[PDB]
């Protein structure tokens, strides 16, 4: 999430982003994958405790 | 599995108000397997029209904790829902039996996946409650071997502004 941004160009002139530059979904056919380390959210379960 | 009978012309506003969980029955894996740290926990109890709002209260790892749900209504008395919020899926809820300013059994299923949890106004509970609730067990099918008791002391109230999930 948020990674679009980076693909984007960017103006100097007016510190600006323009249209897309790098493909921002292409993956080459890879699976690589990167370890979000705030994963954790809190979840209860009324039907247990 | 069936829906029970609730408590007869449930109450809202007399089952309202502060509720101390005492023990549960339920298969459960989460019970059983790590059933130590079974820390103590406690209801605030609202009505909201024909809904409730809950506030359980618990510990974790010593950081109080607030979480607070709606217990929609099933447009019928005593029988509520609760929303599949995190894809949990609905978890539909009974008032089977309850002495407002004493005691009650609250039956609570989710896929068959079946608890029954006393609570009570008081520290203790009287064992012919007890009792009736190791039957409600039983007829649930439930084995002693699956009934699971909470701590006397160290109920929290008033969570943090940080410690609150607000799930609704």
């Given at each position: 999430?948020?990674?679009?941004?980076?693909?984007?160009?960017?103006?100097?002139?007016?510190?600006?982003?323009?249209?897309?530059?790098?493909?921002?979904?292409?993956?080459?056919?890879?699976?690589?994958?990167?370890?979000?380390?705030?994963?954790?959210?809190?979840?209860?379960?009324?039907?247990?405790? | 599995?069936?829906?029970?009978?609730?408590?007869?012309?449930?109450?809202?506003?007399?089952?309202?108000?502060?509720?101390?969980?005492?023990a549960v029955g339920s298969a459960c894996r989460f019970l059983?397997?790590?059933?130590?740290?079974?820390?103590?926990?406690?209801?605030?109890?609202?009505?909201?029209g024909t809904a409730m709002a809950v506030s359980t209260f618990?510990?974790?790892?010593?950081?109080?904790?607030?979480?607070?749900?709606?217990?929609?209504?099933?447009?019928?008395?005593?029988?509520?829902?609760?929303?599949?919020?995190?894809?949990?899926?609905?978890?539909?809820?009974?008032?089977?039996?309850?002495?407002?300013?004493?005691?009650?059994?609250?039956?609570?299923?989710?896929?068959?996946?079946?608890?029954?949890?006393?609570?009570?106004?008081?520290?203790?509970?009287?064992?012919?409650?007890?009792?009736?609730f190791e039957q409600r067990v039983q007829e649930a099918h439930?084995?002693?071997?699956?009934?699971?008791?909470?701590?006397?002391?160290?109920?929290?109230?008033?969570?943090?502004?940080?410690?609150?999930?607000?799930?609704?």
């Amino acid at each position: 999430p948020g990674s679009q941004k980076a693909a984007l160009g960017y103006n100097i002139l007016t510190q600006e982003d323009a249209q897309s530059v790098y493909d921002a979904s292409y993956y080459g056919g890879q699976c690589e994958t990167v370890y979000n380390g705030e994963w954790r959210e809190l979840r209860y379960d009324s039907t247990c405790e | 599995i069936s829906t029970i009978q609730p408590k007869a012309n449930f109450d809202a506003q007399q089952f309202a108000g502060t509720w101390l969980l005492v023990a549960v029955g339920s298969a459960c894996r989460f019970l059983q397997e790590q059933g130590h740290r079974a820390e103590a926990t406690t209801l605030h109890v609202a009505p909201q029209g024909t809904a409730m709002a809950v506030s359980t209260f618990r510990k974790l790892d010593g950081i109080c904790w607030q979480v607070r749900q709606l217990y929609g209504d099933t447009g019928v008395l005593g029988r509520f829902l609760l929303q599949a919020r995190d894809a949990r899926g609905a978890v539909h809820v009974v008032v089977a039996e309850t002495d407002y300013q004493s005691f009650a059994v609250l039956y609570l299923e989710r896929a068959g996946q079946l608890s029954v949890k006393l609570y009570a106004r008081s520290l203790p509970v009287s064992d012919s409650v007890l009792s009736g609730f190791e039957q409600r067990v039983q007829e649930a099918h439930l084995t002693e071997d699956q009934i699971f008791y909470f701590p006397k002391y160290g109920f929290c109230e008033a969570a943090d502004q940080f410690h609150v999930l607000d799930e609704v």
